Every structure is written in structure tokens, then in C-alpha cells.
């Protein structure tokens, strides 16, 4: 006999949805029945997602590949509570439920691609991984010719896991304690791998390999290739001795930049900051000679200074911080700023100014 199983819709649905997230067989899921378990695997040849579903009902071992989006859409479209029977009939997979029948094309399991050497392993809460990624994801490059910038650095150091992302105009770094003594390792996860890892974080075990990373979450296993290349060292990017410290409420500062942005140049998005004793003035103008001005009370006792920024990059940081008060650490008008939560040093943001 060939592969056969019967499974409740609600046992199949979420696993199918997650693995279903080019070439014909790469649009298929590998389905394998073995030892009381249905395994479902999806891949794009660089990363892979595997789900395991316990089989409560009688089944027969075997394997096939079947179109992933069609099979998911069929199962989702069946009524709540439906039992779904699957068997193989020649070159098709027959799906039956109630008086519904679906015959899907298959390709042989033996033709489905398969990937491994592990080097560091640790466990951490899903919320911690999510914080690390959300703190830095927005600063990754998009289609930069420097391929290693299109992803995210994951680094272990001491008892901490760290993420770094940069596109050359801004950088984000976030570190969190893991409570385990870790070897030093730093790998680049491609953008699409970062996105897939986030989709799973609904503890987590991570294995970092030579050329791949693997995440175990519940009954799922995700694997991604790593990016070659030398990622920038964030320690060299942080401003060395930023002597001028401004503190402001995060909501009020963000709201002010967001209003000023309305009258900034649509292409270049430049705003001007004038810092003076306990005061920040933000101005914007555009080619139509329209002008915005915002004045805010802040905590600041340094020299007066004027510095320009792409307001989108500033708003991106303030939206990622989600805190009560922010600290901006300045040096001069042609040097980057460091921005951080006034109450936490777990994340830091570096933004290059524009020339005025």
C-alpha cells in the first residue's frame, strides 16, 4: 500500500499554513507518513520549514509531494470539524471529506530536495528572539549590492545574543541576556530567513551551523542558509565620545517629527534640528517654499547646534523604541547621532546626518 492518512482539519490547518509560507516541485509540500507522524516540508532551496503532526487515526507509511497552496486552500475551505482523508492514486493525491473530492497532481518524494553541521546551540524565550529581531529589522538593507547587508547579523558573545542591521545610512543593534555561557559566533541571516523566523514566534531552540541556522519551535523546524561576507563591526560605527546629550519624551518627539515631515522634500525628507538650552526646534521646508516649525521642551545643557536628518530614518528609530523617554547623543553636524531609550541600553541606534 501507499501513503494514507486521515486527520482532523483543525490538527492540519495551522501546520499547513506555516509550511506553505519558481520550479514546480518547489511549489509542493513533501508529505511523509512514518511512525505515527505526518511530516510536511516546504522549501525554496535555501530555507526549509518542517511541521510534524501526530496521527491519531490509522495510517499507512509513505510519501509524496503535492501543490502546497492548493492543498492548504482545500483544507481551509472545508467546514469546521471536517475529517480529511488522503491517499495516493497513480500520479494524483486524492483528498476526501464528506461528499467533497479533490485529485491533486503529485511529483515523487524522491525528487524533493534535502539539505548540516552544528556549532552552537542555545534556548531562549520566543519573546526574547522577537524583541531582538523587531529592534533591528527595519535597518536592514533592501537589495543593496553589498549582499551581506540585506540580512541581519546574529552574534553570540558572553551570555548575550545580539542582532545588528545596517543599510549604510542607519544602524540598529540590540543585545539580550540568555543566561547561558555561549561561544563567540556571528552569522548573517538573509532577510527572507529573518521574516520566516518571525512567522514562527507565535521556548525556542537555536542551532547555528557552519553555513546554516536552525530554529526549533514547538512541532516546527526552520532552517536557513547563511549569507557569506564580512558584516560591519557595530563597535566601530558607534560614535566615539558623543558629548552633547538631549533627553525628550518619545511620544512628543515622534509626534513633532511626524508633523514636520509633512512639509519636507518628498525625495530627500530632510528636517533641521536646532538644539539650545532645554529646547529643540525642528524645521522642514520643501521646493514649494512651504515651512513647518515645531518647538519642544527637552533636557539639554550643551552648546547650541544645528543638524540635519532624513526624518524617515529618525521616525523609524522612535517607532522601534516604544519607550517613555529617548536620549540623543550628539557630537557635531557632520557626525552620526546615537539614539537610545533613556531607561535601557539593550538597544542602540546610529543615524548619519544630512548636510545642511
Amino acid at each position: 500500500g501507499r501513503m494514507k492518512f486521515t486527520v482532523e482539519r483543525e490538527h492540519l490547518l495551522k501546520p499547513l499554513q506555516q509550511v506553505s509560507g519558481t520550479l514546480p516541485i518547489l511549489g509542493n509540500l513533501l508529505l511523509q507518513v512514518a511512525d505515527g507522524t505526518l511530516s510536511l516540508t516546504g522549501t525554496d532551496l535555501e530555507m526549509e520549514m518542517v511541521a510534524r503532526v501526530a496521527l491519531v487515526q490509522p495510517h499507512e507509511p509513505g510519501a509524496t509531494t503535492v501543490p502546497a497552496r492548493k492543498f492548504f486552500d482545500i483544507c481551509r475551505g472545508l467546514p469546521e470539524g471536517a475529517e480529511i482523508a488522503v491517499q495516493l492514486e497513480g500520479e494524483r493525491m486524492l483528498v476526501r471529506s464528506g461528499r467533497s473530492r479533490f485529485s491533486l497532481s503529485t511529483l515523487p518524494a524522491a525528487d524533493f530536495p534535502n539539505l548540516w553541521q552544528s556549532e552552537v546551540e542555545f534556548t531562549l524565550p520566543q519573546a526574547t528572539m522577537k524583541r531582538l529581531i523587531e529592534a533591528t529589522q527595519f535597518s536592514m538593507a533592501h537589495q543593496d549590492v553589498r549582499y551581506y547587508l540585506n540580512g541581519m547579523l546574529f552574534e553570540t558573545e558572553g551570555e548575550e545574543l545580539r542582532t545588528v542591521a545596517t543599510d549604510g545610512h542607519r544602524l540598529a543593534v540590540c543585545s539580550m541576556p540568555i543566561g547561558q555561557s555561549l561561544p563567540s559566533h556571528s552569522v548573517i541571516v538573509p532577510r527572507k530567513g529573518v521574516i520566516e523566523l518571525m512567522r514562527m514566534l507565535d521556548p525556542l531552540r537555536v542551532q547555528i551551523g557552519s553555513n546554516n541556522i536552525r530554529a526549533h519551535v514547538g512541532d516546527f523546524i526552520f532552517t536557513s542558509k547563511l549569507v557569506d561576507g564580512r558584516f560591519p563591526d557595530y563597535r566601530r560605527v558607534l560614535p566615539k565620545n558623543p558629548d552633547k546629550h538631549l533627553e525628550a519624551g518619545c511620544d512628543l518627539l515622534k509626534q513633532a517629527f511626524a508633523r514636520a515631515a509633512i512639509l519636507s522634500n518628498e525625495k530627500f525628507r530632510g528636517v533641521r534640528l536646532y538644539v539650545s538650552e532645554n529646547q529643540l526646534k525642528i524645521t522642514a521646508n520643501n521646493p514649494e517654499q512651504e515651512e513647518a516649525e515645531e518647538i519642544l521642551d527637552v533636557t539639554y545643557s550643551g552648546a547650541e547646534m544645528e543638524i540635519g536628518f532624513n526624518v524617515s530614518y529618525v521616525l523609524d528609530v522612535l517607532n522601534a523604541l516604544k519607550c517613555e523617554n529617548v536620549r540623543m547623543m550628539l557630537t557635531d553636524s557632520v557626525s552620526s547621532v546615537q539614539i537610545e531609550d533613556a531607561a535601557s541600553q539593550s538597544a542602540a541606534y546610529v543615524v548619519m546626518p544630512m548636510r545642511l
Partner: peptide, 10 residues
Amino acid sequence: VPTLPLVPXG
């Protein structure tokens, strides 16, 4: 539009 001091590319 200066860049951060990334090596290479700034």
C-alpha cells in the same frame, strides 16, 4: 548624503 563609516562603502 554622507554614509556611516562602513568598510567598505561608507
